[PDB]
Design a protein around this nucleic acid. Structure first.
Ligand code: K
Ligand code: K
Ligand code: K
Ligand code: K
Ligand code: MG
Ligand code: MG
Ligand code: MG
Ligand code: MG
Ligand code: MG
Ligand code: MG
Ligand code: MG
Ligand code: MG
Ligand code: MG
Ligand code: MG
Ligand code: MG
Ligand code: MG
Ligand code: ZN
Lengths: 81, 150, 121, 217, 96, 87, 25, 206, 97, 129
RNA sequence: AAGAAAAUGUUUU
RNA sequence: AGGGGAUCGAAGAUGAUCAGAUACCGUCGUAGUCUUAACCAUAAACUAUGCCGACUAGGGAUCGGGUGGUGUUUUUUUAAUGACCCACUCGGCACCUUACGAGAAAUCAAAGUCUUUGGGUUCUGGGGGGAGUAUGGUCGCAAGGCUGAAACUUAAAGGAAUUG
């Protein structure tokens, strides 16, 4: 080494790095549109949700909290915002 | 790190560079403030309000969306607690430890942990009195801590 | 103990090194030739040197020994001139005229070389 | 005669290398003291001390003698050699050879203004051997060499005229003190300065300029 | 850090620490406590007069021999008794 | 280094490492000067004409001389895709 | 003398000294 | 600066891929070799043969820049490269050291020994660490046939290749000698396959 | 000086380890420091396997083994040659023979 | 905890330079750090440096040119008189002809030569040579 | 599997 | 001071050894060993390495958490948990190699970034003894702990390594 572009690290290296150790820190989490079994809204769910998110107009469990990323109740459709 | 331990954990939230609302967010700022106020009236602290907001809704940061912090919004709406939330939870932990201690009286580790917790309480209370969030004569007393947390 | 010392071992070494098309593996003629091809200052030392020379001849007849370089350096020379000439440089043959490479090797070839017979399994 | 080995030595004997500055510039390893003899004829030697060292073995006291020798000319070049031998004279001779082989250049400079013929060191320098650390500080003209006798002799043999010395550690360990002072002297040409910032075209080695000096005909 | 305060406003600790640690020096402690005035038969003086009370033959320490011919002397100044060597070949015959 | 009236009074302006720009001392015996032959008109390896790189004993000891030579060569030519600035 | 037993002896001496001091008044 | 004739050609690319030069070390690879093409599963890492070729041509240019051919010393202690370096020193005017290195050959200016090269080429830095150490003692540049896990200490020109394969080592030495000859002019045109057959450098076990 | 890089034991990050008693002399030694050897001796080798098999009432009995973990103090292990004094460089070799 | 971001930055630069790297990343890159780097660059001891704006205190990537022997802070920032600048330069710099003692004066952060020819003084910040 | 007893040596070269 | 007191076992009793052997070894055995309620506050209480922060080599394991995979296996019904494999990451107990560097050396990834000496901060040392003693204070039921000299004495004591 002894010479490298610290201002332009490769995307692979940045993705390997810890979220706080990238050139500019940023979250690796995201938000999802999850199709509730009811209707009238697609619920927005945090990927690393700590809450047992339910439908706005129903009572089905939409995600289950885990150590990291939340689960998704095994029946759901989800898009990444 | 770890004021009262040898741990060097660095785990924390890495908030984004973008200070603006995400492009997929369409709820109004007034609507987010209404949701915040509704949760506060239900009795949620700012931390759990923000947790609910980002989990079950799309509000990534109430500060980037409404332009104000959750606790600031609560104070503006007249829902600020008597003592700040972190101090309240520290005192609640101290109360629980003290109850467990007066039971069975031989948990020397619990005694040590109580010393640590009340040291944290006193440092936080000193800061709050300095910034005049607490009254200048505010004092944490173990005899009154239970009655002040409930 | 009958271990030959360095003054015998190296004397026999040099004698065998420059007189291989010479004295046979028989001690009686070996010592007689040593009489002419070396200035050994005692009959006992000459006998020791000749006997070790004979021993070295006898163990050379079953294969080269370490540090012995006589006209053995002509055979080795030829057996060093080739072991596969005009046969197969492990190349273009022993195959469907192709190269049996892996997936990542195929991407490596596609990096620059558009023309190479590949049979990526 | 010399009958050189070390094609560097062959070139020096043949006259293709005429100055030791070329050897220093190309960092050529010198293995023959005759190279230094022919390139620095005006090289005077000084025996700094002889001390007995003893190896205990089966009535013991092997009692060899270790001599420290400093060679140099009082212009830019000094060398330090330390040799142990069964006799003092042999130790001195081999130490002179070792010192000549160890000869290095010293970068002299000015304390203040630029008035010619550098009198001091270009920068502060330090050298450490054992516990002994020797620090050389540029001194104004007329200061002289503010050093102990041995370090002062080494410095004047190197060609310094004005320098301050500071020392720490067991300076009475003369061998370590002299080696530390020698390292400090040598670091003068390893310290980079703004006047050396300028980029140079990287000259060609004499071993390549005259390459037909390793053969046998 | 180097185990000592460096702050621009730490002069008090620096000087108090130096004061505390100067007590480990022999001469500073002796001077500040005035040991030479209380102790030290010569009560801080270079010379002292006394009265010889007895000649003594003091055996020299190893690896030497040859007892050293001192005198026990009672100082006029304070009454303290000390032992004083009588240096030269002879010179004990000059002392009574 | 010069005196008044601008004459070079310092002997032996030393070489500097092509990778780290540090001085190559007279006793730096791990330092190395590499000549790469200039190539004209399909080979012929013109004698006496090189591109010269000086590497210091420090770089060689740290094992960075290979990457350093990759970079210096590629900057001067002599290499098309070997060294990458981003990594 | 082993430092531990020197310590023991010193403790015994300290105790005896304290006893004699207290026997005096 | 190198023309498209010096650019890597498919014939010798096929030669390298057949000799398995590209089959680099396992996940244990020194973090000083960026010559690693994307790593295939089963652990073996693919060496970028293009970078290997460029480095080989640069090494050949350095060798050709050496004024005296005899002042180039090619060294192998491992059996797989002894014949390779011997044939290299035959075809080029190099000076070989096969087998034992007799430590003190670069220092220790005595008879029966003490070559004074201007350049040293080794087949394995690990197994030729002694020669590399002495070259570091006496300012001698080093070209080394380096695998992804080979040490890079005091190695100036690393040719990235498999050093576990007799085929790979022999072919790398073959290509180095061929390019040195092409640059020198011994091979007049850089299009003939250099009829000298690329197993003369390969080791001979029986 | 410090003879052994870690210590003459295996305790880093622990602080205290409960002791065991040496099988030879009963000396108390921390469990991490004790020299531990497992013995898997066949219940009868005694040059007597075939004779016991002949006396056996079962065909192909598959005679059992005796398993015993032995903990030695340093003194007893050295004296009984479970472990030997090694050179300074050989001390750093943790691989078993 | 962090008490001198300038000390951290200069130490990082020193370590990178003495390992021979041609670039170094320093965090959190304050204004004093930027001014110190500007003095360094103006005198040629470093090359170009880049401020990376995270919405935190920021980062800086400095390009090193191998001309830096040592840069360091003087902590605490001692008050220095005009006459004391000479003592500081004698104590810290290798020679009188080069190297710089960097001060923070009410006329701004500057090297000791610029301080002397502006006839200003202040607190000592660090050095570079 | 393991294998009893063994204290002392003046001072200076 | 109660309780408990199997085992082992300061003291002690005893057999042996021995020149003596109220030592090692052997057989018993009190206190103790355990517990409760109070005291004591010391250990080679050791990594003989204060704590906080930054940076400076290579490597492979391993513990906890997390991320990813056309992954292996386990069945529930598509999928999914668990265990495992590979890659990455944070935190941890460590280890191996090399030391640019450090060190008197032994050695050290810190004991490095120190005469090119300044990131913050606490504590401690100043030749060996006398001596952790005397004295005073304070704590303790006591044993003792903490604090803690001087007179006087002395040319070494000591660290690491080398050859015998
Ligand atoms: K005597
Ligand atoms: K005497
Ligand atoms: K005597
Ligand atoms: K009992
Ligand atoms: Mg932290
Ligand atoms: Mg704290
Ligand atoms: Mg010992
Ligand atoms: Mg413990
Ligand atoms: Mg005796
Ligand atoms: Mg008895
Ligand atoms: Mg019993
Ligand atoms: Mg107990
Ligand atoms: Mg203690
Ligand atoms: Mg301690
Ligand atoms: Mg003392
Ligand atoms: Mg000792
Ligand atoms: Zn035992």
């Amino acid at each position: 080494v002894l010479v490298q572009d610290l201002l332009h690290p490769t995307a692979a290296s940045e993705a390997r790095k810890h979220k706080l150790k990238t050139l500019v820190q940023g979250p690796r989490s995201y938000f999802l549109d999850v199709k509730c079994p009811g209707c009238l809204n697609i619920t927005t769910v945090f990927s690393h949700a700590q809450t047992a998110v339910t439908c706005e107009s129903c009572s089905t469990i939409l995600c289950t909290p885990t150590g990291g990323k939340a689960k998704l109740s095994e029946g759901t459709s989800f898009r990444r915002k | 790190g770890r004021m009262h331990s040898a741990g060097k954990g660095i785990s924390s939230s890495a908030i984004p560079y973008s200070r603006n609302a995400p492009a997929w967010f369409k709820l109004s700022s007034e609507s987010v403030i209404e949701q915040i106020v509704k949760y506060a009236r239900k009795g949620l602290t700012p931390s759990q309000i923000g947790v609910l907001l980002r989990d079950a809704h799309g509000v990534t940061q109430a500060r980037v969306i409404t332009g104000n912090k959750i606790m600031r919004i609560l104070k503006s709406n007249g829902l600020a607690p008597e003592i700040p939330e972190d101090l309240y939870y520290l005192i609640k932990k101290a109360v629980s430890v003290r109850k467990h201690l007066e039971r069975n009286r031989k948990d020397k580790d619990a005694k040590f942990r109580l010393i640590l917790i009340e040291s944290r309480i006193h440092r936080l209370a000193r800061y709050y009195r300095t910034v005049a969030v607490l009254p200048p004569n505010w004092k944490y007393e173990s005899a009154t801590a239970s009655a002040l947390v409930n | 103990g009958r271990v030959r010392t360095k003054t015998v071992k190296r004397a026999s070494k040099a004698l065998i090194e420059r007189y291989y098309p010479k004295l046979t593996l028989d001690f009686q003629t070996n010592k007689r030739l040593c009489d002419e091809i070396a200035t050994i200052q005692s009959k006992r030392l000459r006998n020791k040197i000749a006997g070790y020379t004979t021993h070295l001849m006898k163990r050379i007849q079953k294969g080269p020994v370490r540090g012995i370089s006589f006209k053995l350096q002509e055979e080795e020379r030829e057996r060093k001139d080739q072991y596969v000439p005009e046969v197969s440089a492990l190349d273009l043959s022993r195959s469907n005229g192709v190269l049996n490479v892996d997936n990542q090797t195929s991407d490596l070839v596609k990096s620059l070389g558009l023309k190479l017979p590949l049979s990526v399994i | 005669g010399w009958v050189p080995v070390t094609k560097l030595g062959r070139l020096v004997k043949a006259g293709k290398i005429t100055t030791i500055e070329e050897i220093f510039l190309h960092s050529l390893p010198v293995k023959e003291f005759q190279i230094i003899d022919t390139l620095l004829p005006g090289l005077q030697d000084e025996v700094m001390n002889i001390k007995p060292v003893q190896k205990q073995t089966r009535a013991g006291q092997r009692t060899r003698f270790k001599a420290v020798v400093v060679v140099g000319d009082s212009n830019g070049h000094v060398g330090l050699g330390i040799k142990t031998a069964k006799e003092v004279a042999g130790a001195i001779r081999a130490g002179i050879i070792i010192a000549k082989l160890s000869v290095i250049p010293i970068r002299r400079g000015y304390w203040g203004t630029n008035l010619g013929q550098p009198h001091s060191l270009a920068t502060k320098t330090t050298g450490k051997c054992g516990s002994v650390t020797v620090r050389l500080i540029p001194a104004p003209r007329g200061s002289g060499i503010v050093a102990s006798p041995a370090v002062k002799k080494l410095l004047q043999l190197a060609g310094v005229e004005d320098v301050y010395t500071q020392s720490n550690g067991k300076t009475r360990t003369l061998e370590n003190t002299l080696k530390a002072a020698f390292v400090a002297i040598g670091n003068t040409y390893g310290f980079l300065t703004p006047n050396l910032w300028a980029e140079q075209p990287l000259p060609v080695s004499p071993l390549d300029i005259y390459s037909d000096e390793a053969s046998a005909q | 850090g180097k185990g000592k305060p460096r702050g621009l406003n730490s002069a008090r600790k620096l000087r108090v620490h130096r004061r505390n640690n100067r007590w480990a020096e022999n001469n500073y402690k002796k001077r500040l406590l005035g040991t030479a005035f209380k102790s030290s038969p010569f009560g801080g003086s270079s010379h002292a007069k006394g009265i010889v009370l007895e000649k003594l033959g003091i055996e020299s320490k190893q690896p030497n021999s040859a007892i050293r011919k001192c005198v026990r002397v009672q100082l006029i100044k304070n009454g303290k008794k000390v032992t004083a060597f009588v240096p030269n070949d002879g010179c004990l015959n000059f002392v009574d | 280094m010069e005196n008044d009236k601008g004459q070079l009074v310092e002997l032996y302006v030393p070489r500097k490492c092509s990778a780290t720009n540090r001085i190559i001392k007279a006793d730096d015996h791990a330092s190395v000067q590499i000549n790469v032959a200039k190539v004209d008109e399909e080979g012929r390896a013109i004698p006496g004409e090189y591109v010269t790189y000086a590497l210091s004993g420090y770089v060689r000891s740290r094992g960075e001389s290979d990457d350093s030579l990759n970079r210096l060569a590629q900057n001067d030519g002599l290499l098309k895709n070997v060294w990458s600035y981003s990594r | 003398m082993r430092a531990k037993w020197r310590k023991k002896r010193t403790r015994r001496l300290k105790r005896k000294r304290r006893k004699v001091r207290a026997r005096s008044k | 600066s190198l023309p498209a004739t010096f650019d890597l050609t498919p014939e010798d690319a096929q030669l390298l891929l057949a000799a398995n030069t590209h089959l680099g070390a396992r996940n244990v690879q020194v973090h000083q070799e960026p010559y690693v093409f994307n790593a295939r599963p089963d652990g073996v890492h693919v060496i970028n043969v293009g970078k290997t070729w460029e480095k080989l041509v640069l090494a050949a240019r350095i060798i050709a820049a050496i004024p005296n051919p005899e002042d180039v010393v090619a060294i192998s202690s491992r059996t797989f490269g002894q014949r390779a370096v011997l044939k290299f020193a035959a075809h080029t005017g190099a000076t070989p050291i096969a087998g034992r290195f007799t430590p003190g050959s670069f220092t220790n200016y005595i008879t029966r020994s003490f070559k004074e090269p201007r350049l040293v080429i080794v087949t394995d830095p690990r197994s030729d660490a002694q020669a590399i150490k002495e070259a570091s003692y006496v300012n001698i540049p080093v070209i080394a046939l380096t695998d992804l896990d080979s040490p890079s200490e005091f190695v100036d020109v690393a040719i990235p290749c498999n050093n576990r394969g007799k085929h790979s080592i022999g072919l790398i030495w073959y290509l180095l000698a061929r390019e040195v000859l092409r640059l020198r002019g011994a091979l007049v045109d850089r299009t003939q396959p250099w009829s000298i057959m690329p197993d003369l450098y390969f080791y001979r076990d029986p | 000086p410090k003879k052994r890089a870690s210590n003459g034991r295996n305790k880093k990050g622990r602080g205290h380890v409960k002791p065991v008693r040496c099988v030879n002399c009963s000396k108390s030694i921390p469990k991490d420091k004790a020299i531990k050897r497992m013995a898997i001796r066949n219940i009868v080798e005694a040059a007597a396997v075939r004779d016991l098999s002949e006396a056996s009432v079962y065909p192909e009995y598959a005679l059992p083994k005796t398993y015993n973990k032995l903990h030695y103090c340093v003194s007893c292990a050295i004296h009984a040659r479970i472990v030997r004094v090694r050179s300074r460089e050989d001390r750093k070799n943790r691989a078993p023979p | 905890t962090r008490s001198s971001v300038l000390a951290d930055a200069l130490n990082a630069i020193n370590n990178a330079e003495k390992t021979g790297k041609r670039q170094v990343l320093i965090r959190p890159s304050s204004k004093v750090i930027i001014k110190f780097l500007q003095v360094m660059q103006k005198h040629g001891y470093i090359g170009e440096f880049e401020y990376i704006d995270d919405h935190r205190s920021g980062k800086i990537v400095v390009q090193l040119n191998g001309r830096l022997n040592k840069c360091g802070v003087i902590s605490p920032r001692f008050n220095v008189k005009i006459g004391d600048i000479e003592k500081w330069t004698a104590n810290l710099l290798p020679a009188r002809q080069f190297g710089y003692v960097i001060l923070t004066t009410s006329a701004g952060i500057m090297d000791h030569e610029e301080a002397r020819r502006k006839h200003v003084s202040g607190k000592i910040l660090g050095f570079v040579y």
